[PDB]
Structure 1
Amino acid sequence: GRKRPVPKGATYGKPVHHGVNQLKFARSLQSVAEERAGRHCGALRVLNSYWVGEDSTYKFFEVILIDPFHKAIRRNPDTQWITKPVHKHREMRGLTSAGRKSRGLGKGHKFHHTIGGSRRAAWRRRNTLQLHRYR
């Protein structure tokens, strides 16, 4: 998991938030894995990852990356969607299969938060005073 980075304990505040030890990151380890592969190879464009094993201390992963500017990708029409600049840094924005999962979006009753684009957007919609002209 993820221990709360605060000196000693000293999460000064209401004792709801006193927790430091038993608390857990939103994204997965696999996403973190991709994100790091993405960070390192900036030109490369993270497509997707898979698992290759796990020790007590570590996990292992295998992130498939793609050159967006290698002609064989550029000229192949079926891949040339990744060469478009909206797909810069998929992993960073929560867009690979892995980092999609944290966002908490799927069709049906088991979601509703994320019933616009995303979690943030629904909240946004739900907490707008729409103030009409005529009222």
Structure 2
Amino acid sequence: GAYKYIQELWRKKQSDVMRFLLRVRCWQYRQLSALHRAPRPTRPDKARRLGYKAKQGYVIYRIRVRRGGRKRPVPKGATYGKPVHHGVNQLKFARSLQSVAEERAGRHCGALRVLNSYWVGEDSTYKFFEVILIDPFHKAIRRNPDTQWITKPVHKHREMRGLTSAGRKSRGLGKGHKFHHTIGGSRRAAWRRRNTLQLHRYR
């Protein structure tokens, strides 16, 4: 179809057609609210690749997330400790801003369930994304066997455990020699299993 034609266009962000159209929506979203609903995906090729099926029950929310890094919340610096922990200004956050975007939408719209998000526009002071939520209690979602996995109670608040594509990136889990410090389930699980004493019965 035409999606592959749209696919290679969106990889041309520096081109004049994209450099224009990106700055329109970036201007357009910047006059809107911080958290609101979009009727249809503005980036449809990236939607269906992430699992968006255009039907009743698929609702998307386009939010704006503040640019930059994170600074330590302490009055006048207030780190009554060693020079290692006086660092307050050039600190960075652990989770990606795309994962923070799925939090603010998922937490506020706790009636729905998060699936995936994607980049739609950038500014020096903001960072815009369109998260794809799902409705757990519409029969068009409930009756299709491919998507009834959402309704299971372990898929409540995937944005709070980081089970999304943005969520799975920041935990740093994967296969290979590079992720030895998270062999097991989690970075907490690897450390826990590495620091217990196995007091055998016969030692």
Common topology (TM > 0.5): yes
The Cα shift of 1:109 comes to: 0.4
Unaligned runs of 5+ in 2: 1-68
Give structure 1 regions of 4+ aligned residues with deviation exceeding 4 angstroms. Answer: none
Query: Going by fraction, where is strand more abundant, 1 or 2?
Result: 2
State how far apart, in whole Å, the 1-side matches of 2:170 and 2:179 are: 12
The Cα shift of 1:7 comes to: 0.6
Q: For residue 91 of structure 2, what is the aligned residue in structure 1? A: 23
The Cα shift of 1:12 comes to: 1.1
State how far apart, in whole Å, the 2-side matches of 1:84 and 1:53 are: 33
Q: Deviations over 1:36-66 (max 9, x none)?
A: 1100111100000001010100000000000
Where 1:134 maps in the other structure, the secondary structure is: coil
Residue-pair matches, total: 135
* CA root-mean-square deviation: 0.6
Query: Going by fraction, where is helix more abundant, 1 or 2?
Result: 2
Q: Deviations over 1:13-39 (max 9, x none)?
A: 011000000010000000000011100
State how far apart, in whole Å, the 2-side matches of 1:102 and 1:128 are: 26
State how far apart, in whole Å, the 2-side matches of 1:84 and 1:3 are: 38
The Cα shift of 1:94 comes to: 1.0
State how far apart, in whole Å, the 1-side matches of 2:200 and 2:170 are: 35
The Cα shift of 1:113 comes to: 1.1
State how far apart, in whole Å, the 2-side matches of 1:64 and 1:117 are: 26
Where 2:140 maps in the other structure, the secondary structure is: helix
Write the mapping of 1:1-135 to structure 2, written as runs, cut at 5 A.
1-135=69-203
Return the TM-score normalized by structure 2.
Answer: 0.66
Calculate percent identity across the aligned residue pairs. Answer: 100
The Cα shift of 1:100 comes to: 1.0
Q: Deviations over 1:59-112 (max 9, x none)?
A: 000000000111000001101000111000001111111011110111000101
